[PDB]
């Protein structure tokens, strides 16, 4: 419209922004793994590498519980899903690149949602 | 338990 639309701040405007975003990131194919937490072991030495495994599920669920009271909180979690994906999963394993794929989309989401601030 | 994930994880074919 004509408002700020670049600085959410409020834990509500954020929560659901981040809620709809996470939704969209998750909606974004590339966020197919981050969606649900990994088996920690079915995963080829994943938890052995991934000292920081976050999943969009826990994200929107934490976000649900009203944990995304901060724009970046949301991020550290989403950004995190991407991190672990890039941490172990190769950029050719369809996993990592996915991180980068959605993370890109996700990037347009946040910046659009005035979230992202780097 | 009884989770239906999609992360193939186990090396088999992802690209």
For chain A, the first-to-last Cα distance in angstroms comes to: 25
CB atoms within 10 A of CB A67: 18
Q: Which of A40, A43, A55, A96 to mutate to test the interface with B (most CBs of B within 10 A)?
A: A43
How many angstroms away from the CA of A112 is the closest CA of chain B? 29
Alpha carbon distances (Å) from A20 to A40, A41, A95, B8, B11: 27, 31, 22, 26, 32
Q: Among residues 49-88 of chain A, which lie with CB inside 8 Å of chain B?
A: none
Can you tell me the distance from the alpha carbon of A47 to that of A50, in angstroms, rounded to the nearest whole number? Answer: 5
Experimentally determined by: NMR
- Chain B from 1 to 15: CB within 8 A of any A CB: 3-7, 9-11, 14-15
Considering only CB atoms, which chain A residues are within 8 Å of B6? Answer: 32-33, 35-36
Which residues, including other chains, have CB under 8 Å from residue B11's CB and lie 6 or more apart?
A: A44
- Give chain A's domain count: 1
Q: Of A5, A1, A24, whose CA–CA distance to A13 is shortest?
A: A5
- The Cα–Cα gap between A115 and A30 comes to 20
**CATH number for A57:** 1.20.920.10
Please state the three-class secondary structure of chain A as a single string.
CCCCCCCCCCHHHHHHHHHHHHHHHHHCHHHHHHHCCCCCCCCCCCCCCCCCCCCHHHHHHHHHCCCCCCHHHHHHHHHHHHHHHHHCCCCCCCCHHHHHHHHHHHHHHHHHCCCCCC
Spatial distance between the Cα atoms of A66 and A103, rounded to a whole number of angstroms = 22
Domain that holds residue A32: 1-118
């Amino acid at each position: 419209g004509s408002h700020m639309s670049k600085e959410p701040r409020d834990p509500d405007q954020l929560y659901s922004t981040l809620k709809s975003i996470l939704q969209q990131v998750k909606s974004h194919q590339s966020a197919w793994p981050f969606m649900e937490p990994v088996k920690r072991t079915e995963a080829p030495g994943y938890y052995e590498v991934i000292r920081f495994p976050m999943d969009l599920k826990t994200m929107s669920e934490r976000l649900k519980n009203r944990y995304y009271v901060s724009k970046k909180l949301f991020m550290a979690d989403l950004q995190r899903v991407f991190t672990n994906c890039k941490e172990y999963n190769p950029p050719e394993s369809e996993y990592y690149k996915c991180a980068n794929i959605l993370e890109k989309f996700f990037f347009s989401k946040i910046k659009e949602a005035g979230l992202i601030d780097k | 338990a009884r989770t239906k994930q999609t992360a193939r994880k186990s090396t088999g074919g992802k690209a």
